[PDB]
Amino acid sequence: LKSVKIGYVNWGGETAATNVLKVVFEKMGYNAEIFSVTTSIMYQYLASGKIDGTVSSWVPTADKFYYEKLKTKFVDLGANYEGTIQGFVVPSYVPISSISELKGKGDKFKNKMIGIDAGAGTQIVTEQALNYYGLSKEYELVPSSESVMLASLDSSIKRNEWILVPLWKPHWAFSRYDIKFLDDPDLIMGGIESVHTLVRLGLENDDFDAYYVFDHFYWSDDLILPLMDKNDKEPGKEYRNAVEFVEKNKEIVKTWVPEKYKTLFD
Structure with a gap:
């Protein structure tokens, strides 16, 4: 199976988002691996291309110390969440x-x-x-x-x-x-501020379908808050709850994926 690697830090919202994207990539036929690391290691790995992307960048203020140092080694695709x-x-x-x-x-x-x-x-x-x-x-x-x-x-x-x-x-x-x-x-x-999606230097060239999902992932309080809350009340169930989220929010998830794949979410 084709491969995608997502780095994250185990805070509630970032773990929710990362497990949701894991489920999305799986339904697209990827072996989607997610990696729970420290903030420093997440940014390091992104810059050396040992992960393909993160949806966990808090910018500009929270992550300034890491982002300023490494911005020439990753691509910032914009915000996946604002506010x-x-x-x-x-x-x-x-x-x-x-x-x-x-x-x-x-x-x-x-x-x-x-x-x-x-x-x-x-x-x-x-x-x-x-x-x-x-x-x-x-x-x-x-x-x-x-x-x-x-x-x-x-x-x-x-x-x-x-x-x-x-x-x-x-x-x-x-x-x-x-x-x-x-x-x-x-x-x-x-x-x-906002949370941004960053991807490694070669991703757009190497796997355009994976790039496209990182580039289109976007959501808001009415999706993320219930999920973060549910995960808190159901410890250890973040992947199962992401599977349910993707089933329950078919039309939004569809917007994140290339045309080719949209019916896999029906």
Whole structure:
């Protein structure tokens, strides 16, 4: 069978998207392999062509550190999703509105910001924001993972305790919990951005059908949020739930594939 390789990092939305594309390529007759790696390795592998594509690039702000360094070694096809935001998040019952109001209040947070995976773009920029706003001596930024960060948020809110986390949209946490972004006066965390699809240098030449799918993949909150939420409630079922997603959203999926293949999704 023909081959395509997709790199991703195991955050909820990117794992949802990557498993959906895996299912799409399988239905087109590919041995579609997906590879769960670190952000750094995903970008490295893309640049050396050891994967064919990623649908996980958060730009320009979150992934600046990786993207700027390697942009001559991949092709940026545009956005597959528009409307991202990353930033500092607290439960709504915490009575501050801005990142600067955190100054002097470290004690209420046990002097910690409960973060995600070391090296994630959002984690990098969060550390840069803590430095910029003069908070880094008072708040220790803790690396862990999306799962640990969300379990800690869930725990703190049930206790009615203050907690500070880096969070982002799109995420079901904003509908499941009453939480808020803090204001970011100098926009260190970026404005509203997008997730892009990047492919290796030779892909357009080598496998135009695979290029076409990467080039046409696009979706929105009404598809990704229910899927991210369902996957969270059904741990370990992301591939099965992607199979169901592709069956349930035939017409949209059709738009991502060359004419030749569209009836395979009927």
